[PDB]
């Protein structure tokens, strides 16, 4: 896994998530090109706890393009919590301890909020087509709905 991690104040958290190369349309964001790139951050001030925010969206639905790269960027912005992002086959429900080996791709469990910071990492994903989850490991966070769903295709 991913467990090497950076740290970002607040104007670089939000410059980060800005640069996410998706297309909202409800709750599904559209990538397109050769390397897309995903920004995604764990339960952002006043979105529902637990969730991950992407493009301003909460647990949207990835639309991916078959023989992409993915570059994801990963932030946790929830004080008081470790989340991680894994990225898996298995779909919900997901147990209070998820059973979803093999991640594919993903992180360790994040920093804590910290000093007035926020820990980050990047990594970079070449899937085969098909469905995947994100989802955090953190026990029950899955659970009680800190997942969303990716289409590869
Ligand atoms: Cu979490």
Known sequence: ??????????????????????????????????????????????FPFPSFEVHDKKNPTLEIPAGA???????????GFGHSFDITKKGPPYAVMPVIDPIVAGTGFSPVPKDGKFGYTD???????????????????????????????
Request: glycine share 10%; aromatic share 10%.
């Open 1 to 46: 896994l991913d467990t090497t991690w950076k740290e970002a104040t607040l104007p670089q958290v939000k410059a980060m998530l800005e640069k996410d190369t998706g297309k909202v349309s409800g709750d599904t964001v559209t990538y397109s090109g050769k390397t897309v790139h995903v920004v995604a951050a764990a339960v952002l001030p006043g």
């Open 69 to 79: 790269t993915v570059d994801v960027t990963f932030i946790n912005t929830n004080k």
């Open 123 to 153: 990594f970079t994903w070449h899937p085969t087509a098909g469905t995947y989850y994100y989802v955090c490991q953190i026990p029950g966070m899955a659970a009680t709905g800190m997942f969303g769903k990716i289409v590869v295709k």
